[PDB]
Enzyme design. Structure first.
Site, PDB file in Angstrom:
ATOM      1  N   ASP A   1       9.505  12.820  -8.308  1.00  0.00           N
ATOM      2  CA  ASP A   1       9.359  12.013  -7.100  1.00  0.00           C
ATOM      3  C   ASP A   1      10.398  10.893  -7.106  1.00  0.00           C
ATOM      4  O   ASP A   1      10.096   9.727  -6.851  1.00  0.00           O
ATOM      5  CB  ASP A   1       7.940  11.459  -6.975  1.00  0.00           C
ATOM      6  CG  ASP A   1       7.624  10.983  -5.570  1.00  0.00           C
ATOM      7  OD1 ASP A   1       8.434  11.250  -4.657  1.00  0.00           O
ATOM      8  OD2 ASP A   1       6.569  10.341  -5.377  1.00  0.00           O
TER       9      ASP A   1
ATOM     10  N   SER B   1      -2.250   4.999  -3.434  1.00  0.00           N
ATOM     11  CA  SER B   1      -2.930   3.892  -4.097  1.00  0.00           C
ATOM     12  C   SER B   1      -2.716   2.623  -3.279  1.00  0.00           C
ATOM     13  O   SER B   1      -2.126   2.645  -2.194  1.00  0.00           O
ATOM     14  CB  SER B   1      -2.416   3.705  -5.523  1.00  0.00           C
ATOM     15  OG  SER B   1      -1.066   3.275  -5.508  1.00  0.00           O
TER      16      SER B   1
ATOM     17  N   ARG C   1       0.840  -1.188   0.000  1.00  0.00           N
ATOM     18  CA  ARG C   1       0.000   0.000   0.000  1.00  0.00           C
ATOM     19  C   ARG C   1       0.878   1.241   0.000  1.00  0.00           C
ATOM     20  O   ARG C   1       1.889   1.297   0.705  1.00  0.00           O
ATOM     21  CB  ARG C   1      -0.939   0.025   1.213  1.00  0.00           C
ATOM     22  CG  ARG C   1      -2.145  -0.888   1.081  1.00  0.00           C
ATOM     23  CD  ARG C   1      -2.945  -0.948   2.372  1.00  0.00           C
ATOM     24  NE  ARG C   1      -2.252  -1.702   3.412  1.00  0.00           N
ATOM     25  CZ  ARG C   1      -2.771  -1.983   4.603  1.00  0.00           C
ATOM     26  NH1 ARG C   1      -3.994  -1.574   4.910  1.00  0.00           N
ATOM     27  NH2 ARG C   1      -2.067  -2.677   5.487  1.00  0.00           N
TER      28      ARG C   1
END
Ligand SMILES: NCCCn1cnc2c(Br)c(Br)c(Br)c(Br)c21
Ligand SMILES: [Cl-]
Length: 334
Positions: A155, A50, A46
């Protein structure tokens, strides 16, 4: 006067030369597949955006990975889908196989080709000096491609780098923050994780470019060769720039603030204070060495620059002597 504008050194007009349909994700019509062709096998983990599942395509009996995205604005999902579709086939970039919505929940889900469940942060301790050189070069392969496709990842961090160490295959994942680069466009500074934010984000300079990913990559290499995760361990956004100033010094930071005429908080200047530049050899200690080399420190010094225009591009980085034997061994072994 306001902040001085900036332009990317390379890949500046790649989206300008391409047609409008390439980067105008808002005008793109998403062609959704049928979710019934996929069944979730098991849970892979997880994320903060999402939930990742292991799945099987029941039409061709192929193993895939489904990423059920949590509720988000419709312009962000279209941007990510268009970016993933534009980067299909790229080296070391995840391959978007399909896009589906739940027939009842209507929540979107991305379907990718199967990649093993092991990221870079889980292996950076059990890898030799050559192995981090090899995988860093594979990351640069994926960063140079998407930059050449006019796309910033925004990112970059060890958790977004999946490693199949048995097959020596690397994949750069999590493109939810990615965005097309356009000259003169001011971008959102709320990107990347705190420990991997470039100084342009920490000083609220919005006209950044591909060079942001190169800073994030510099923080990753510094964390591995020195075995200190994270390398810049800021507790908040202000302290993050302080942690960076305690290493690179405040001299080059102020000359960076005045170069682009950036207006900082009047109390931010008193918080940064004055710090000398610390040589990279002060973080070597004795266990984390053997991963350290003169070409490694020189390569790290050229990535972790305040001036985003002064950092190395992905291509220039791939030609640094740090990867000299890596590119020689890759060119003869595959
Ligand atoms: N842009 C979406 C990239 C796909 N993707 C996102 N989070 C992922 C995780 Br967590 C794992 Br584990 C695997 Br395998 C993949 Br593939 C993931
Ligand atoms: Cl680049």
């Amino acid at each position: 006067s306001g902040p001085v504008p900036s332009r990317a050194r390379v890949y500046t007009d790649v989206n300008t030369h391409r047609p409008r349909e390439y980067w105008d994700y808002e005008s793109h019509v998403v062609e959704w597949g049928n979710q019934d062709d996929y069944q979730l096998v098991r849970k892979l983990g997880r994320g903060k955006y999402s939930e990742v599942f292991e799945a099987i395509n029941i039409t061709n009996n192929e193993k895939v990975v489904v990423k059920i995205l949590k509720p988000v604005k419709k312009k962000k999902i279209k941007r990510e889908i268009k970016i993933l579709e534009n980067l299909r086939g790229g080296p070391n970039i995840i391959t978007l196989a399909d896009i589906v919505k739940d027939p009842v929940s209507r929540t979107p889900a991305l379907v990718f080709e199967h990649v093993n469940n092991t990221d870079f942060k889980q292996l950076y301790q059990t890898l030799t000096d050559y192995d981090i050189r090899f995988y860093m070069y594979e990351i640069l392969k994926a960063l140079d491609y998407c930059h050449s496709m006019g796309i910033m990842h925004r990112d970059v961090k060890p958790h977004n780098v999946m490693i199949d160490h048995e097959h020596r295959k690397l994949r750069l994942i999590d493109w939810g923050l990615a965005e097309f680069y356009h000259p003169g466009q001011e971008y959102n500074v709320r990107v990347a994780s705190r420990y991997f934010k470039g100084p342009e984000l920490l000083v609220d300079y919005q006209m950044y470019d591909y060079s942001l990913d190169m800073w994030s990559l510099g923080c990753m290499l510094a964390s591995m060769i020195f075995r200190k995760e994270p390398f810049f361990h800021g507790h908040d956004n202000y302290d993050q720039l302080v942690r960076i100033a305690k290493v690179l010094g405040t001299e080059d930071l102020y000359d960076y603030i005045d170069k682009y005429n950036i207006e900082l908080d009047p109390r931010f200047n008193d918080i940064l204070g004055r710090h000398s530049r610390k040589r990279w050899e002060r973080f070597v200690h004795s266990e984390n060495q053997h991963l350290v080399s003169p070409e490694a420190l020189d390569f790290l010094d050229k990535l972790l620059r305040y001036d985003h225009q002064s950092r190395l591009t992905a291509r220039e980085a791939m030609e640094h002597p740090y990867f000299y034997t890596v590119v020689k061994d890759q060119a003869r072994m595959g």
